[PDB]
């Protein structure tokens, strides 16, 4: 039953890292809160997410 919380984490982290790569390559700017969030900051957030997914991939069936 815990195989569906890893699938959610895997898919959502994949989306986040792909979007971070997209915004870093194309120099885009998403504005939803706080700052303009840049594309470099979104790459950094994608890297945080990828580190978390790498960590939680160590402990899985």
């Amino acid at each position: 039953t815990t195989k569906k919380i890893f699938q959610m984490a895997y898919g959502i982290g994949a989306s986040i890292v792909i979007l971070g790569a997209l915004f870093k390559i194309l120099h885009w700017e998403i504005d939803f809160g706080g700052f303009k969030l840049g594309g470099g900051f979104l790459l950094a957030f994608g890297l945080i997410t990828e580190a978390i997914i790498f960590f939680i991939s160590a402990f899985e069936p």
């Binding site: 194309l26 120099h27 885009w28 700017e29 840049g38 594309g39 470099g40 900051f41 790459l43 890297l47 990828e50």
Partner: protein
């Protein structure tokens, strides 16, 4: 599963950490020291240009019959040059505001984030990047039109300023054609970009002191 699958995901891990591959601390220190020397030489150049303008004042005051045209051309050149210089300095200060509290800590600049989100979008120029390119081309055009393009007077100074202040597509070492702004500032560390902007400012100052050099003669 497959050895090839583990090896492609090892390449994944290797190349995602190559996102952290930047210039070394020595290259950044060299860029920062070049920026310091460039700024000092630019301040010296501006002082020399102001002295040249004052000398043109002294000459034209005595003989307002042969130097008045030269004086008016020189003053308009100074207006264009200082406008372009102040625009470049505005961009340069905006870049230096994003590095941290210590301004001469060149090891940590190395980012290329603030600048290429204000020059480029996708595969085009963001409106202010086009503003930069337009400023360069307008400085080139309005300076030439005060002298004469490749003909008449000053002969080859026009050819020189048509070489420094280009925005034409440049071909890189591989042979692929690159747009000028993307070639010169996209992905460049903050300190490298600021050094390059100070280089452009040095071109401005050298150009205008070479103009006033011809004014006196």
């Amino acid at each position: 599963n497959s050895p090839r699958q583990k090896m492609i995901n090892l390449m994944y891990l290797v190349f995602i950490s190559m996102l952290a591959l930047n210039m070394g601390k020595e290259v950044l220190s060299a860029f920062g020291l070049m920026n310091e020397k460039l700024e000092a030489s630019n301040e010296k150049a501006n002082n020399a240009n102001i002295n040249a303008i004052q000398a043109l004042e002294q000459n034209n005051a005595e003989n307002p019959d042969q130097f008045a045209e030269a004086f008016q051309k020189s003053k308009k050149v100074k207006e264009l040059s200082d406008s372009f210089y102040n625009y470049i300095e505005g961009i340069k200060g905006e870049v230096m505001n994003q590095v941290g509290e210590d301004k001469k800590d060149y090891q940590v600049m190395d980012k290329s984030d603030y600048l290429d989100q204000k020059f480029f979008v996708g595969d085009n120029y963001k409106p202010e990047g086009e503003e930069f390119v337009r400023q360069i081309n307008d400085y080139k055009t309005q300076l030439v039109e005060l002298l004469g393009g490749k003909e008449g007077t000053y002969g080859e100074l026009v050819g020189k300023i048509d070489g420094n202040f280009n925005t034409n597509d440049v071909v890189d070492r591989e042979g692929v054609t690159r747009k000028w702004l993307n070639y010169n500032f996209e992905g460049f560390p903050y300190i490298a970009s600021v050094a390059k902007l100070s280089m452009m400012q040095s071109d401005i100052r050298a150009t205008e002191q070479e103009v006033y050099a011809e004014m006196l003669k």
